[PDB]
Amino acid sequence: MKNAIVIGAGIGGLAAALRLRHQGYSVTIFEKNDYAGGKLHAIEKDGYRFDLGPSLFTLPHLVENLFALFPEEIIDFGYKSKAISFHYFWDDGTLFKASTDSSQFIEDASKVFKEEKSTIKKYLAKSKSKYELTKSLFLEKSLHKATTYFSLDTVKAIVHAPFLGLNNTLNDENSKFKNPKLTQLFNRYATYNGSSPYQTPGIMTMIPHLELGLGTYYPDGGMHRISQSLFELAQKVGVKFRFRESVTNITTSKNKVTGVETKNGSYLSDLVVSNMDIVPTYRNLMKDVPAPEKTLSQERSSSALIFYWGIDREFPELDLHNILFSEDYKTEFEHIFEHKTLAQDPTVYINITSKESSNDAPAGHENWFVMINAPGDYGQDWEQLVEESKKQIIAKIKKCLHVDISKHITTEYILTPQGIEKNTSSYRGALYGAASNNKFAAFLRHPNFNGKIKNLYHVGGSVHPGGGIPLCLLSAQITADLIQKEQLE
């Protein structure tokens, strides 16, 4: 039986390992940290639990597909569907509580924004058709097509560009709404891959379909249960783990992978699958191999700055997912992507899992995950940025919720783009690999195979097909399909 080594226990690596296991490989995952899940990590601090990374759960069938590979194993993983997606607030007092029932969303949005129902209806149906077309056409495509060098392979993208909105920006399509608050609400979806609504293509209007047509869910135990259930499953089906052991080099011979090295020794495998960020994969682990320099130089997605606050009271106006919109979104993104700094009026996301699992906070308290969009680390003075952002975020919460939250903070943890970078070796602290700030960027990501080194594969959020849970999971599926194909040949 052949063996595979997976470099990193992120969601992509865990998924890949599970798939290779199902195929019959023996599998070992190396992890630099003393925990599994990478960005899907959690902490418990002074009476509060916090998810550290992903907070939004859509497309739960993609996780279930992994359990389905091992129908006999007993893994407790469940989730519920929510009636409400997000609460949205603005400085002028406007609040929109957004239903996951599309009929109710359209009616509510119509009244709250004084906007024609037909406009909202047509937009959501177009968002749906975009998703289904993109899924059918690009995410379900077969792997028949092969070759010795890199290729574009998407005349279909050009056929369908007018319908998908590939030649305009997200904001071009979102500016159809008359109320600018509604334009803003839908421009927010550019953050779902760390891009700007003013640059990312119009195909991204499909993103709200995920949470508004397909459901918004909450897993039992919070988001941490996603990586941990998968870790538990992996361990039960025989995947081996080497924790606190960073891979330092990927070994080859005669242009085929032979295994990896760590500070502790060398290990051989028939296959290597890296779940490490593609930049240090080349820069650090393949120092003797020629790097695809343009791929590695693609613009980096945005990062984040997060404050985790225990809060000594309740806010009945807040649900699980809440947004306090900046009064000037265009400036917000300009700072982030053009100047690598922070605008003074931020869009603040407040996530509160204690609304779903009351054990996540003391009785009558809340566990606030408080996040603003942020540039990656390019040498800024992060100490000053954090100090400044804190005061602006507190100012934002006074404008929108009419409370001085500083009187209620009982404990604080902070995560910056430096912390993000250190935690998981994500280059620049970018949350989603390369940004998607033009129509080529998706088609310019590193593939899941490697054209120089046979039997070396790549999985996760910095490579094809993209950042975020659903796409990282597809990364692993595609990687495993490739390998099975190669076996058959």
Ligand X SMILES: Cc1cc2nc3c(=O)[nH]c(=O)nc-3n(C[C@H](O)[C@H](O)[C@H](O)COP(=O)(O)OP(=O)(O)OC[C@H]3O[C@@H](n4cnc5c(N)ncnc54)[C@H](O)[C@@H]3O)c2cc1C
- Find the binding residues for ligand X in span 441-480 (CB under 6 A): 460-461, 467-469, 472
Q: Which is nearer to ligand X, 177 or 468 (CB)?
A: 468
276 binds ligand X (CB under 6 A): yes
C-alpha to C-alpha distance for 195 and 435, rounded to whole angstroms:
5
Q: Which is nearer to ligand X, 165 or 461 (CB)?
A: 461
Please provide residue 192's backbone torsions phi and psi, each rounded to the nearest 5 degrees. -70, -15
Length of the chain: 489
Half-sphere exposure of residue 242: CA atoms within 13 angstroms, side-chain side:
18
Site string for ligand X, 100-139 (x = CB under 6 A): ----------------------------------------
Task: Give the 3-state secondary structure of residue 207.
Answer: helix
Distances (CA, A) of 426 to 149, 158, 254, 277: 28, 32, 30, 6
C-alpha to C-alpha distance for 268 and 106, rounded to whole angstroms:
57
Q: Which stretch, 10-18, 19-27, 144-152, 232-240, contacts ligand X (CB under 6 A)?
A: 10-18
432 binds ligand X (CB under 6 A): yes
Tokens of 263: 């500070």
Pick one of 63, 66, 304, 480: the residue that binds ligand X (CB under 6 A): 304
Lay out the sheet containing 456-458: strands in order across: 240-242, 26-30, 3-7, 271-274, 456-458
C-alpha to C-alpha distance for 15 and 470, rounded to whole angstroms:
11
Minimum distance of ligand X from residue 12's CB (angstroms) = 3
C-alpha to C-alpha distance for 126 and 164, rounded to whole angstroms:
9
Distances (CA, A) of 290 to 286, 434, 459: 8, 20, 19
Q: Which is nearer to ligand X, 19 or 32 (CB)?
A: 32
Site string for ligand X, 52-81 (x = CB under 6 A): -xxxx-------------------------
Q: Which is nearer to ligand X, 52 or 124 (CB)?
A: 52
C-alpha to C-alpha distance for 246 and 427, rounded to whole angstroms:
16
Q: Which stretch, 25-33, 122-130, 131-139, 326-334, contacts ligand X (CB under 6 A)?
A: 25-33
Q: Which residues are annotated as a binding site for FAD?
A: 12, 31, 39, 55-56, 247, 275, 431, 461, 468-469
Q: Is residue 370 within 8 Å of 311, Cβ to Cβ?
A: no
420 binds ligand X (CB under 6 A): yes
Minimum distance of ligand X from residue 431's CB (angstroms) = 4
Distances (CA, A) of 464 to 124, 442, 444, 479: 27, 8, 9, 10
275 binds ligand X (CB under 6 A): yes
31 binds ligand X (CB under 6 A): yes
Minimum distance of ligand X from residue 184's CB (angstroms) = 19
Q: Which is nearer to ligand X, 106 or 170 (CB)?
A: 170
Minimum distance of ligand X from residue 226's CB (angstroms) = 9
Minimum distance of ligand X from residue 342's CB (angstroms) = 16
In the numeric block, the tokens 């009026």 are attached to 345
How many residues bind ligand X, per CB under 6 A? Answer: 36
57-90 in b/e form (b: 16+ CB < 10 A) is bbbbebbeebeeeeeeeeeebebeebebbbbbbb
Pick one of 4, 21, 38, 203: the residue that binds ligand X (CB under 6 A): 38
Give me the residues that bind ligand X (CB under 6 A), please.
7-13, 30-33, 38-40, 53-56, 246-247, 275-276, 304, 306, 420, 424-426, 431-432, 460-461, 467-469, 472
